Design a protein around this ligand. Structure first.
Ligand code: CA
Ligand code: ZN
Length: 361
C-alpha cells in the first residue's frame, strides 16, 4: 500500500482503523491489563502510524523493497553458509519480536513504532500485488492500483471485524501459544486471498469496476487482519507471554551514523555450541550490506535442527578484508532474536577494523 513518511496514507489508515476496530469489538469478559495496554497504545497512535509507513523509507541492504513481498504458496545446503532473505511474513515476525521486547521493558513509544512497522508488512502481504509477487517492474498495475486505492482509502474503512472478542475470529488468534507459528499461517491466509484477488480482479487485465471491488476486499482484510495482530499483541504483552528448538536466528544490526561507519568488506555471523561445533554464515542481503547508518536484518539457518537456546554458548560477527581499502566498521547495536523473543541486545559503538572477530555472546 502507499504510505507517506509523516505517517499518513493507506498504511496509516489501516493501523488507525485496526485499533478503532479492536475497540468496537472488544469483549466484556476482557482482562483489565489488556484494556489498560490498549490505552497505552492509543496514547502512542502517532508512533503506530509512523511505523506503519516508515518501512517504505528505510535505507536497507534491500535495494528494492524485496522484503515487502511474499509468495504464500512457495530448503538446501546453500543456506547453512548464507543468510536467508527476509519476506513480508518474516518481517512481521521480527518487528513483532522487537515490539514485544520494547514493551516488556518500558519503551511503549518505540514498542508501538516497531509494532506499526510489523503491520506495514502485513498490510503489504494483504495487497493483491505483493503476495502474487508482481513488482512495479513485473507490471504497471502495481503502482497504478496502490495509488487508485490511495485516493480512495477513506471510502473503504471498516468499523468491525464482524465478530466480538469472545467470538470465533478473535479467539483462534489467542489459541496458539507459539506466535511465530500462528503468525505465519494467519498471515498466509490473508496473503493467499491477496494472490487470488490479483488474478481475478486486480490485475492490469481484470477491469476498473473490478479494481473498486478489489480494493474494497483487500483493504477491509488489511483492517480485520491488522486488528487481529494488534489484539494478539495486546494479550502477549500483558502476561509476559513467551514463545522450543532454535532452528533459525535473526540478527537485527543497527550500523552507526558517524561517517565511514559502514563497510564494503565481507561480514560473517557465527556461533559455537556447548559441545564445540561451529557455524558461520555470510551476512549478505541483495543490495549493499552495512551502509553507514542503515538497520539490516540477517536470518540464519542452523545445521543442528534439534538445538535449544542455552546450548548456543557463543555468538560473534567477523570481518574479512575485501581489499587493501580500509572500510573499518562501527556497529551501534545488535539484537539477536530466537523464536519471537529477543535474546541478545549488545550495544557496541566500538570500531572493528581488519579481520577482527567481535564476540557478542
Ligand atoms: Ca550481495
Ligand atoms: Zn505498502
Amino acid at each position: 500500500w502507499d504510505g507517506k513518511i509523516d505517517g499518513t496514507g493507506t498504511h496509516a489508515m489501516i493501523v488507525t482503523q485496526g485499533v478503532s476496530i479492536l475497540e468496537n469489538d472488544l469483549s466484556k469478559n476482557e482482562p483489565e491489563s489488556v484494556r489498560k495496554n490498549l490505552e497505552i497504545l492509543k496514547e502512542n497512535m502517532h508512533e503506530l502510524q509512523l511505523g506503519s509507513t516508515y518501512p517504505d523509507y528505510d535505507k536497507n541492504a534491500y535495494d528494492l523493497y524485496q522484503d515487502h513481498f511474499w509468495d504464500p504458496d512457495i530448503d538446501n545446503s546453500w543456506y547453512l553458509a548464507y543468510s536467508i532473505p527476509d519476506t513480508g511474513e518474516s518481517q512481521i515476525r521480527k518487528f513483532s519480536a522487537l515490539a514485544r521486547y520494547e514493551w516488556q521493558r518500558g519503551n511503549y513509544k518505540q514498542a508501538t513504532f516497531y509494532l506499526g512497522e510489523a503491520m506495514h508488512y502485513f498490510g503489504d502481504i494483504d495487497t493483491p500485488y505483493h503476495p502474487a509477487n508482481v513488482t512495479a517492474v513485473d507490471s504497471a498495475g502495481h503502482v497504478k492500483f496502490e495509488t487508485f486505492a490511495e485516493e480512495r482509502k477513506e471510502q473503504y474503512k471498516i468499523n468491525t471485524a464482524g465478530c466480538k472478542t469472545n467470538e470465533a475470529f478473535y479467539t483462534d488468534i489467542l489459541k496458539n501459544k507459539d506466535f511465530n507459528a500462528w503468525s505465519k499461517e494467519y498471515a498466509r491466509g490473508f496473503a493467499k486471498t491477496g494472490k487470488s484477488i490479483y488474478y481475478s480482479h486486480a490485475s492490469m487485465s481484470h477491469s476498473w469496476d473490478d479494481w473498486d471491488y478489489a480494493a474494497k476486499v483487500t483493504l477491509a482484510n488489511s483492517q480485520k487482519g491488522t486488528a487481529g495482530y494488534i489484539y494478539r499483541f495486546l494479550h502477549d504483552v500483558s502476561e509476559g507471554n513467551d514463545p522450543k528448538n532454535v532452528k533459525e536466528l535473526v540478527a537485527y544490526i543497527s550500523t552507526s551514523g558517524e561517517k565511514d561507519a559502514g563497510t564494503d568488506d565481507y561480514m560473517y555471523f557465527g556461533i559455537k555450541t556447548k559441545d564445540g561445533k561451529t557455524q558461520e554464515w555470510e551476512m549478505d542481503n541483495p543490495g549493499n550490506d552495512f551502509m553507514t547508518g542503515s538497520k539490516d536484518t540477517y536470518t540464519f539457518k542452523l545445521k543442528d535442527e534439534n538445538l535449544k537456546i542455552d546450548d548456543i554458548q557463543n555468538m560473534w560477527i567477523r570481518k574479512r578484508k575485501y581489499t587493501a581499502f580500509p572500510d573499518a566498521y562501527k556497529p551501534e547495536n545488535i539484537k539477536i532474536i530466537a523464536n519471537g523473543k529477543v535474546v541478545v541486545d549488545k550495544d557496541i559503538n566500538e570500531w572493528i577494523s581488519g579481520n577482527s572477530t567481535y564476540n557478542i555472546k
